[PDB]
Design a protein around this ligand. Sequence first.
Ligand SMILES: *[B]([O])([O])[C]([C]C1=[C][C]=[C][C]=[C]1)[N]C(=O)[C]([C]C1=[C][C]=[C][C]=[C]1)[N]C(=O)C1=[C]N=[C][C]=N1
Ligand SMILES: *[B]([O])([O])[C]([C]C1=[C][C]=[C][C]=[C]1)[N]C(=O)[C]([C]C1=[C][C]=[C][C]=[C]1)[N]C(=O)C1=[C]N=[C][C]=N1
Ligand SMILES: Nc1ncnc2c1ncn2[C@@H]1O[C@H](COP(=O)(O)OP(=O)(O)OP(O)(O)=S)[C@@H](O)[C@H]1O
Ligand SMILES: Nc1ncnc2c1ncn2[C@@H]1O[C@H](COP(=O)(O)OP(=O)(O)O)[C@@H](O)[C@H]1O
Lengths: 149, 284, 50, 248, 50, 50
Amino acid sequence: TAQGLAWTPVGGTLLTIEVAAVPGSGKLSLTGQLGEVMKESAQAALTYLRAHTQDYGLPEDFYNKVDLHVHVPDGATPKDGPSAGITMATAIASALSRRPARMDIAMTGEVSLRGKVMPIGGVKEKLLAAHQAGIHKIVLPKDNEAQLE
Amino acid sequence: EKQAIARQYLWPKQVRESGMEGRIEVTDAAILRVISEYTREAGVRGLERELGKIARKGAKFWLEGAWEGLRTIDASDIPTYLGIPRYRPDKAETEPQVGTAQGLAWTPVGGTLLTIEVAAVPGSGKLSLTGQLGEVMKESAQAALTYLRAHTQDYGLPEDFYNKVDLHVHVPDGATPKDGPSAGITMATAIASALSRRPARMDIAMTGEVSLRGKVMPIGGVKEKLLAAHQAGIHKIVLPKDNEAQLEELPKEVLEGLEIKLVEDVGEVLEYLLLPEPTMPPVV
Amino acid sequence: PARMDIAMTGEVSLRGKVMPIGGVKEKLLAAHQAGIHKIVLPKDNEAQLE
Amino acid sequence: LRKKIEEVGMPEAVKTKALKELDRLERMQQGSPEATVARTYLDWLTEVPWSKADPEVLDINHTRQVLDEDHYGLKDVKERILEYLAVRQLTQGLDVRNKAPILVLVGPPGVGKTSLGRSIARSMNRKFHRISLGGVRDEAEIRGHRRTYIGAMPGKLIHAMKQVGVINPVILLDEIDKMSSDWRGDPASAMLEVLDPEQNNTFTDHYLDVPYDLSKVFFITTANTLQTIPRPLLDRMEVIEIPGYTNM
Amino acid sequence: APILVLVGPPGVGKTSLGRSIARSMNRKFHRISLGGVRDEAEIRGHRRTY
Amino acid sequence: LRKKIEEVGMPEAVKTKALKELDRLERMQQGSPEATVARTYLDWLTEVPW
Ligand SMILES: *[B]([O])([O])[C]([C]C1=[C][C]=[C][C]=[C]1)[N]C(=O)[C]([C]C1=[C][C]=[C][C]=[C]1)[N]C(=O)C1=[C]N=[C][C]=N1
Ligand SMILES: *[B]([O])([O])[C]([C]C1=[C][C]=[C][C]=[C]1)[N]C(=O)[C]([C]C1=[C][C]=[C][C]=[C]1)[N]C(=O)C1=[C]N=[C][C]=N1
Ligand SMILES: Nc1ncnc2c1ncn2[C@@H]1O[C@H](COP(=O)(O)OP(=O)(O)OP(O)(O)=S)[C@@H](O)[C@H]1O
Ligand SMILES: Nc1ncnc2c1ncn2[C@@H]1O[C@H](COP(=O)(O)OP(=O)(O)O)[C@@H](O)[C@H]1O
């Protein structure tokens, strides 16, 4: 489970991403009314984690022994975008490595296959929403430090 | 051309039009920073608006507390007169990376840089193509992979990657739609480097279609791609042989700065871009 | 066997965590017309029993 | 009326138009369908202001002390307003009528737009008047009607001038997004004719025929979006974006 | 040698070239900017009977 | 207009229809919005080749 941040036209919103790793054959299910860009970012994060399978203590062959399921509550609310990349990377790595993720840290950021964190948009609504809900720690891309002013 | 137009015609008009007369002045680096970081347009009107903003800032700072003579605005003072930079220029890499290659794109507002990146993980012979790619570009990827499956002994590729390796091709960023066939070679370089564990030189941009038997076919829009490759600091281009008739549309100082190599076969590209020794352990 | 004299409603998440719903009034009135006297309801909907 | 008309103000073509109704003597005590139109015409002619202005303060430090005690937040919007006002006071003569980067206030509904217009108009100590442009789709709603008709009515700007006797008031053209254009009519051409400060000095109506003092009459426009303003009006503007408010 | 048309993106100088051509041959310069209506009944007028 | 209707053309039924329309236009008073429609219609019937 990891804590993420969204952008509505009337302000920001906390969103929780939770994933499950159950025994299976390697399928990937993606529920919660997700758009196409968000499914592609989840697939990019999973490919990055399959490449670096020894750096983080992941199992050696989870690509054909584990079915993953990525769910973003709630249903009946369509969600899209790509700023959710490192949140899903954190959630998938926490579920595969059986290591708990800290929930008192919000995060946001687009991911690529080399593991590079890309800039995002709408940073001040997300940070105001994270502040007025009681979260005091943020992970942000370095190329968004211009907009912290 | 935008820098020269802003020097000659635009900036004195905006200064005289705002009320200042020679109590304020910009340099050339400030003009190039304003163009590159506050303006994305084919015309010139947004740059005219930005110079108007700078002159109106200077008029307000004159009317708060005046100064003596001339004040020369440098490139550091542009965010103090315009705010947060709202665009990010393209940067060229410098290190040979394994599994990626440097490509060129084309918009109706100017060429950009695009980076193809490919991961090769153990699996069962499945191809994934993400990054909002159209159909022509997916078929270009399939043609490049079939050429590489037919020629595994020539490049040191593994003997059975068609049923032991999953491939994934990603083109950042994931939100803008990307289409066309002009990057057939870039994908063939990236897939071959990802499968054979040897790095690809990021000094060199490249373009051109590919056929199923390995012929580099000509492409379109070469001057915008070459200008964008020159502005980002890349001095080596791989280009199809059939586009040498179109190099005469470039400025002379741009053409002297670029070292252009003209190809017909894909093997000429893979000999030139890949470094001859593996650095990582193989996939399977 | 699941006992059938209990009507229930609620949204489930992947962690096993019941989340609130809408239209509680009409659902409880329809369950009370039919003769069901036992309801399972999420905790965040007790503000709407009023 | 010949007591009323020979007073302070009016130019001399106005006087040649003003000597029209001496020999328009007897058609109003009996009849007529177009008798009170001339009575009302010279009432309009002596009613509009002439040669009386309010002397203006243009100090930006007094403008900050006006704006900050009327609104909370909106500090960057205040600063861009100050920049526009500073370049307004700094230019006299040339390049003040060649370039009017006319203010456009863009934001969602519910933010303070009209209140900023009244606060700007109270900062320069001048007399505010608001003209809404909601359902406006005909040029005679901005211009006049011909006095040769039964119902002849001048435009809204003659009303805005006859409210307050200053030569140069502050007028807020509210909601120019909603100017609907179709076949046979759009008053955006009259908007460009009255709005660009290089042909508005030769403005006229279909009701009155004299030129006007629409020279330093300060203008502010508001909008909810940009994409429905006509393109010949989207060259004389300078947008200022009001985003929406923080919880605190 | 027929009607000349000037094609390109906006922002590139396409009106200032027209003024340069007009002043080079000592004419005068106008600009209709058509498209403000949705009919062919505003290029040609309507008669007095309307 | 009566002379013009008599000169050019016409088929016989079209001629009688145009003459009845002309008499109808002669009975009514001018400037009314009924009269301009009949005047425009007779203008179209006369200047079409028969
Ligand atoms: B990211 O791209 O900036 C982000 C994606 C996201 C974040 C957290 C949870 C799900 C998705 N995008 C958004 O904030 C999107 C809106 C958006 C999408 C594309 C471009 C710009 C902005 N947010 C949502 O989808 C959303 C859904 N429900 C409520 C609020 N926001
Ligand atoms: B090529 O066809 O000249 C090239 C395709 C391409 C390949 C790899 C990455 C990006 C693009 N074309 C373009 O750059 C296209 C325009 C095009 C498309 C189809 C046929 C002819 C020309 N441009 C883009 O896809 C693009 C441009 N800018 C940003 C994002 N995408
Ligand atoms: N920043 C602010 N400070 C103080 N009062 C404000 C502020 N913003 C809005 N208000 C008040 O909000 C109320 C509504 O303001 P309006 O100008 O009517 O909103 P509006 O968005 O302009 O409405 P429309 O429909 O878009 S024209 C007024 O009483 C204002 O005083
Ligand atoms: N090549 C050029 N040299 C000098 N000035 C230019 C050039 N191109 C554009 N401009 C300036 O930019 C402005 C663009 O205005 P305009 O020609 O109306 O744009 P458009 O033709 O796109 O409507 C002109 O006023 C002109 O002064």
